[model samples]
Target chain A: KVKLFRASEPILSVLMWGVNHTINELSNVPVPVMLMPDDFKAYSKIKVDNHLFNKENLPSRFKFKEYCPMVFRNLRERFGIDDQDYQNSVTRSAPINRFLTTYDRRFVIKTVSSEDVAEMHNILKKYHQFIVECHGNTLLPQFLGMYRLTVDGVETYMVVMRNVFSHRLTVHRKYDLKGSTVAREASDKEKAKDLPTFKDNDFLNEGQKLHVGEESKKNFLEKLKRDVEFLAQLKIMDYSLLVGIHDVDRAEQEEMEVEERAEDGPGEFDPSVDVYAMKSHESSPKKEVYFMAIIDILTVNPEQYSKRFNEFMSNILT
Target chain B: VKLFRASEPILSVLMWGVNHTINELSNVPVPVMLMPDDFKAYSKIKVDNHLFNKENLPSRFKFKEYCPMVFRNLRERFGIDDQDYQNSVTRSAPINRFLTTYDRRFVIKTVSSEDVAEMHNILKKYHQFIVECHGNTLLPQFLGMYRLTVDGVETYMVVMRNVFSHRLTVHRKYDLKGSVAREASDKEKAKDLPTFKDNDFLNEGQKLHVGEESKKNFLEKLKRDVEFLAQLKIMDYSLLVGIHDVDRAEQFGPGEFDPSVDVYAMKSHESSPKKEVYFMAIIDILTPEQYSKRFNEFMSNIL
Candidate 1:
């Protein structure tokens, strides 16, 4: 039996519908031996005008457009995201918001500008090659799909990616880290959020530390070096490493008050599902789960920033 | 990348198989004209991708599409684009086994192998009827048919346009079989929106008010549709009527619809107190010709 995702709003419902629709359509289209040059520019647009059918939830009329479907589908495969699962993650229920996530929270759907879409088109081929070079191991954004939704004639663009935070672990606090020491702290107002997104200054001021074993730290650093260099080569900048901390001890106590979420929401994350997640050493004083990935790599940058970024992150870890 | 995504493994397999089959169909060229063997023909693909899209699909599965060429033509005859049809099914698993797509643009139903074979039987005739009428007939717009396999078990499915408007609100529904024998059980009546029958229509003293102008047009199409089905000895179909209250639609927004797009729709008479949009179509087209003719007569009188 097929199931309905009881989403709270029309836009959310349409998001689920659009993702499901585009992905299913892609299933029928041939997966090219390789994405052609034109594939980066290709898109699928569908306008639905429904009557007396499924009116209880979704609006009878809405439009969905998927940009560079073939390219995104390829990215999804490279990132180890099945189109159906991606569709379900977004469609099975409403994606929550600022940075939205699928009902299960395994995927993140972020809003972007028409320019971001254009920039995406600009670096698509290079970004795809980078994904290939790393064999899908880099901490760079794992973009799964990008779309434009038109409900009531207003258009909204969105990009889907594998969420950087552990799917199961509750991140007690998180930070967005850049090398610059200027104007990078979360304001007191921003820090008041339930899960405030702290910035570079906050990371240092808190005297925080991460403990991945020596081998892991080395491997992580190596990946950082290669990824940032690639970013520098693209001449892209203003990106940061997003780090999320899930304190296991605190999490266990909170699960009593929390609902325990869904099927896989009560354990250490399955690294396969949360590719960015890493477990702290058993020898550490505080048992925890840490998620780290570079995010927002859409602007211009310098190699000097990458170098300093690496240095700071390395020191933050024991 | 993702795990089995549909509510069930069968659906995940369904999405994968349709993708595989459609891609296979894309490889073949569209012919000058469809031949007879094309009806009995099928496209079958066995897929095994190790360490691949294991997120929502299995490593091994099979997909078989019955008469791909015939269906493509049928889709064209119905004014449904092949890509759109493919997108609707592969995009997301249908919400309910007896569900509409999230957008309410189409409908999907699980069928038995018998239904699949029967589809093979009447497909050519159905296409002819659809074409002769220029897709104006009040029949289910059959777009696709397939057999999906996951873990050795097989399931058959069919896709069709929602006879009702894709965007209008269906405030009430009726499954009219003409000389109705059964309908709206006491249990069913207790629900907010129950599947009512002919008896319910007669008992409620309900009459679809479309005025003479719209009535003549709606009946002409219905009559032509019934004759076509009867000629093929297909019977036991019901007239599925859906009503949309215009007032309710206004709350969503005021915009008109293209009848060409909203196929089976008709606006109520200008004089009617309540403005409404009605959808009328034939469903379950597989019964005997005698009943088919009787159904036409009953449908004509019901209004």
Candidate 2:
């Protein structure tokens, strides 16, 4: 009767079934008026030891664990994500390149460790508070949900977050920027790819500037400063500003030449949905759009580094 | 931080399901418009217990709340918020059979398995009626519905607005269906608060003086409500009437009632002989379309 995810490969099929089950189950849990300290340590663990089940894209038996569903669900609400939409995104289609982006590129399911999860728990409370205070305005990674899947006795823990890149606009060039303290740059081998992650040194050396208007500059810097401050308070650093460049003219030409590229009416995006997007300032410049957000935020470091982090990022924009 | 009590395996599992489900649904954004998916959506949970909280509840049980999305929406349209309903159920255990949640804001009924299936059938049209009437009609404002499997036996339950007052005690009660040829037995009456029939009310000659204002409003509400029952093809529900004497109520330290808390309570008319209050609401719209008109007429005479 419940005919869904039939074509999905076994792992994805299980993930779909697992997500659908857990979310549906969460529907019963009475919402706590407030999150308590113990909530961070809580998880929903379900073991399905099936003897013979739908074998197309699933293991005969597997365990699916959703960590801190309450916390992450609250976070998702704070980030304006509908639980149904979040459910559909992962379960609708198999995730492609995910060791990277989900097939739709709306989300990313990244493999983390017990250490990463533990570290996340340590910073989880503050992270949630920051999101609430920010009113979902920051460039920080929008953490939607977290889970652990065990297939054939091997366990894989993953955190799902909004993909920093525009799902519609193809990123021609990308950058992962931290402060230029250690002369950071992408390698020759790294630049060999189609959308290589160019870095701070690359940006400065190439005389590149983001060229979002002063109005946009003011708001962007304000968020960057507040975000790094929050990061500093948690002693979290070594996170990068993930900047994705979408040259509008180039994208148009590519779309003109490319076959079967029917997504978002040829390279245009709605700013409301694309939280990190900024259009080219009309005064003088190439037609461009950029996607930027803070990423790899699980690690902790010096508070002093956050101040430097804000300053370096502000200077990258015109 | 208040703890919830699990009286027995079945009740605890019911409480667990209710508590958990309410919290989970809070995350869903309330849609401005109801979609088809909202009606059919439900929440199902199963807990497999080897040795967890063995004293109060069985470790293994399943809770399937029927149409949580639709029911929560229904509660909203009926002017009840999920928060208040949840707070009552979770704050303290229900008092006793078809137990009132300790706060008494809601009643948990141990209903038949038949009602669960029937509830789904009527819910859609009932909601439409509620929306059309602006919640003015007297009907079962079914708030929460669940089916729990305990010790491998499944039981269905529903939560509805209490027909009686949360704050006031019903000194005398009547279940008036407008027609019963034979005299009623006192067997049920011998219990703690008995369900007296229409025959008893006719013999005693009870009249409700709700003043011209409530009388007109009450009758107007009754007509539309009866029509809705007709549309659903359901029949056979009683009008539950409760009378609370204020002077007798005043004996227990002048408990001059607040009309707001007791939903059905109406202050006695200004020129009435005794200081008494009346609580009358239609019960069991959950049951029809036909006998409803006559029952409404009979109820109007009692009013």
Candidate 3:
């Protein structure tokens, strides 16, 4: 049985409200999340407590508290981790792992089979080049190693990593339940009575109110557009790669044909060119919100990754 | 200039009324138009005289009289000129030619190009196999032959085949104007709706009024469920294939690494076994329809 944390209505409401507002704000901003000071550390600790620490019933170590805070910070400063690296790590690995454990403890046991482990290891090995080096703002959790441990007479692997200090940067929590509420609230207002006529001094006197209203609309539209654009870009990249693969197969067929022609006279030629054309005809573009998304969709979404792919394909052909 | 035939209010209203009644009496015990019959052909010919051999168009042949009526009557007797020889026409040859053209067209034109010819050839090749075994009830239009000529023009090749027959079959019309109308109609339908729903009463009860309402609702729900199931199945299949591809890539990676390992341990007294593992990450899954959908989105509107 999974034990879920039941929040007080007041606390839930406040947290939920804040989360929704944050999501709305993040949706408009180019950067997903801008963390506040101590937020990252607090988040990391909460995740550990709820998932690894609490579930395992492990005592909190002073060394963990001391070292974890500096892990991400040191990596960021030393390695010069960029925004893209940080985005990939947070969106794909950290959040997904957190969600799986939170949703259901059994999810971990059921979903992550030996095949999945192997897949994860293989993905990491292939795309290791993209791993952001930790510096001032630590992008990655330090790898501590994994152990097969018996818990409640059940064997499970506990993968340990050095905790990093959360850089209090505002991060977009797009998938958070709170964000949905903010969107609903904003949309509700738009659906309500027509906007009040702009007062003579509304710009100067009621700037905050005016800004909030405008920002909400902008955020909603921007969020929708971005989601659509991302999905579209993903599809285009997939197609381009497929086409490339097909060309290679055709080239191979032509080569074989030439070889056959050379071996036998033109009169005796039984021209049988075995061409292998692979087409991925059917697929669903599910928005994966964890490291799986990054590994599976983003990192090697298709074939060769070229910069400005989305931008290049945006314009209408003349 | 591209001319669009304006919908006559009288004809439009009549069609609308008939369609409306057909939709309303969807459960009624009426013979539904499963496939267009001779009556439909005659009505269409009357509605659009340019489509049929009319007094105004002296050059118009008696092709209409032969088709839909004569064709339906002689459907059983209709056979290929040389069934055995036609069957021996290998699927690979046409498909290979089509594929080569598909690739070359892409190279020649900077814009995105679809292998319509290749797709047609694939369908035809499959049909050839079916026809060889006397399995096909109706012969599909020679769309592959039609596209070859169209593509040949782009490549500056001397096309010997008559375009009129190819055009009539490919475009599926006796006249150019009618052909254009058919093409536009297809494009319009493709843009508007992705699936077709046919109303047939073969499985339904003879007393249509009693079961009509219930049957309509049941059919609609059944169609929706089937579509949903198909989409889910596609998603599952794509995920499985992606996983398999990643595993295969990893297996191939070991061979690539062996040479590097050999060089490093050339003259070593003690050599340690070095293994290199390469794995591909899972990418997105997409169906051909979904891919086209994406292409449409990227191109913005239709290309």
Candidate 4:
């Protein structure tokens, strides 16, 4: 049976449908010896006019446009992601959590602005060069794809990225740190939610620290600094360091209860999948896993601010 | 992923086979023209998956395409793009034993090994005929023929351009071999669209009044194709007739169609009794000689 990509909304279904289609079609295409200049400007567009065709979950009519296909494809490979695995992550089932994550939590989908797409097009060549130079090792968002979905004539731009958090690990606490002081705390209303995104002020006020050991600390900081420099080169700023803390002890206990009641060796995750995750040092007080990555790197410029940001993040880790 | 999923494993393989071959053909640069050896060339792929990539196909199966180069040339001659043809088959599963592509642009008929052999025998001559006719003829437009093996049983299939319109509905249809005492079985007649025969056509006073100009051209092609089949000592073929009433209910705006797409479709005469569209073509033209001249004569009289 075909992947229906059934979802609560037609937009998500169309997203799944588009990714599945483009990936499969790409599989037939031979990889070029090297990407050409036109590769960055290239895009693949398909308009579906369903006259009693397969429209079980998808809209009878909609348009799917993928931008910079070759570039994104190259990026996917550089990120060590298989085309089939990426397709499966999006299409094995409908992307869940309202475009925030796939059902399996392997990928993150974000709705961006039209200008964002334009800016992406502008910097794509440079961004790709940077990615290649870093060997896809930067803390910057690992952009897998960019697409435009036109459903009911409303055009929506979206970009796919590797999730900073582990697909299987539970993030007991999370923070969106911008290395700024003013009005950066999570509101009381936000703090009341299940997984509230506590901000810079909240992290500082709580005296929180990431105990990732010296080796991981150096590598993460170096990557972060390199990423920040690259973003700064493009006059981009206001990005945040997204940190997710997975409490191993709590997860183990939760898994035990679920097993007694419903399953993994808890607390551990595949690093290849959880690309940003690092195990806490044994000397730490609590057993924890930290998922750290740079996010919102699509806009702004601040050499001083980025340096400060790097400093704040470096200090946060033991 | 499309998965090329179908109700049966054989169909899945058919979709996969076409998809695979067409993609491979896309990479192979189109030649200036075909050579004699092209007619004899075939491509065969045997898959012993050994528990790999079995999501939509049988782990153990074989897909063999007869005369790939010839068929590719035939496809190009038929105004069918390799990419478009691939999408029609691989985009969705062909629906039945004698199934049409989901878009109904092509038909995939499961044939006997003997029929496939028969096809191989006439392929070179058939290709020449089609090329001379400029892809205009009443005979079945054989596109791609394949042999698929699953679970140790080999099944042969032939692909053809659908005679009926992909969009317009055929309210009535018939399978006429220009012979007497040929009628649809009571069981077959019970269906919504039955393949009525020569007797049924004569008894019901049915005729394809496509006017004189259209009639002459159609008859000329029919005569030529039948003569070519006759030369090959091929017979037992029938004229598959389909009628679409413009006034009848339709999927879209009534009577609207592209003649290029619905190759067999014809408009009735302006002065005719009814405003109907007719689809008639020579089908099942794969058996032994004789009755060929008589078959052409009978087909001519029907119109």
> In candidate 3, what are the lDDT values of residues B152-208, reduced to their tens digit?
122211101111111011111111110101222444445432211111111121111
True contacts kept of each: 0.00, 0.00, 0.00, 0.00
lDDT of 1 by residue, A174-292 (tens): 99998775679898899888989898888888888898888888888888989998888776787899999988889878876566554345447777788988888767778888999
In candidate 2, which residue ranges exceed 4 Å CA deviation? A1-147, A150-318, B49-58, B252-260, B288-290
- Number of the candidate with higher TM-score, 1 or 2: 2
RMSD of each: 20.6, 11.7, 35.2, 20.0
Residue A63 displacement (Å), model 2: 7.7
Q: Cα lDDT of all candidates, in order? A: 0.77, 0.75, 0.22, 0.84
Q: Which 10-residue window of candidate 2 chain B scores lowest in summed lDDT? A: B48-57
Query: DockQ of all candidates, in order?
Result: 0.02, 0.02, 0.00, 0.03
Error of 2 at A205 (Å): 25
Provide chain B TM-scores across all predictions.
0.91, 0.92, 0.17, 0.95
Q: Which stretches of candidate 3 lie over 4 Å from their true place?
A: A1-112, A129-148, A157-301, A304-318, B1-303
Candidate number with the higher TM-score (1 or 4): 4
- What is the iRMSD of the candidate numbered 2? 11.2
Residues B167-253 of candidate 1: C-alpha lDDT, one tens digit per residue: 776878899987737568898888877789988877877777789898788788888888877777777788999888887876735
**Descending-lDDT candidate ranking:** 4, 1, 2, 3
Among all candidates shown, the one with the greatest TM-score: 4
True-vs-predicted CA distance for residue B161, candidate 2, Å: 0.7
What's candidate 1's DockQ score?
0.02
lDDT of 3 by residue, A1-318 (tens): 121112332222222222222222122223214323332222111101111111111221110111122222323323443323332332222122311221111112122234433433443322222333211111122232222222233333333232211121111111101111112122344334443222112222322111113333343233323433333433423211100111223344566898999997111111111011111212313211111001112254422232232232221000
Indicate the residue-level lDDT of A3 in model 4: 56
